[PDB]
């Protein structure tokens, strides 16, 4: 019944990364937006910058866009971290 458009990306960072460089957070935000814009129209992009698992959520216009994003990003490397990407479970908050 739910056609999932929201992708949850994990291990993109650790919140300590933002302790001693105030610019890293927005650099990461835009890195993600630039990459994800190739997968579909982005409706909302959020970084949970105090979440210990390094979490981001990207919501797309179409569920096929979320699928393409998940296919391309899961297991990819970002700043020395191997990230995961999965469809939102519809219930967990970050």
């Amino acid at each position: 019944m739910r056609h999932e458009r929201v992708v949850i990306i994990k291990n993109m960072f650790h919140p300590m990364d933002f302790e001693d460089d105030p610019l890293v957070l927005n650099e990461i935000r835009e890195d993600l937006r630039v990459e994800c814009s190739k997968f579909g129209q982005i409706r909302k992009l959020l970084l949970f910058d105090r979440h210990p698992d390094g979490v981001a959520s990207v919501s797309f216009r179409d569920p096929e866009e979320a699928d393409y994003c998940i296919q391309t990003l899961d297991g990819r490397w970002f700043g020395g971290r191997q990230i995961t990407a999965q469809a939102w479970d519809g219930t967990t908050d970050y």
């Binding site: 990461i28 890195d31 490397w77 970002f78 700043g79 020395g80």
Partner: peptide, 6 residues
Amino acid sequence: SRWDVK
């Protein structure tokens, strides 16, 4: 960018 840095 940080994309793909291992």
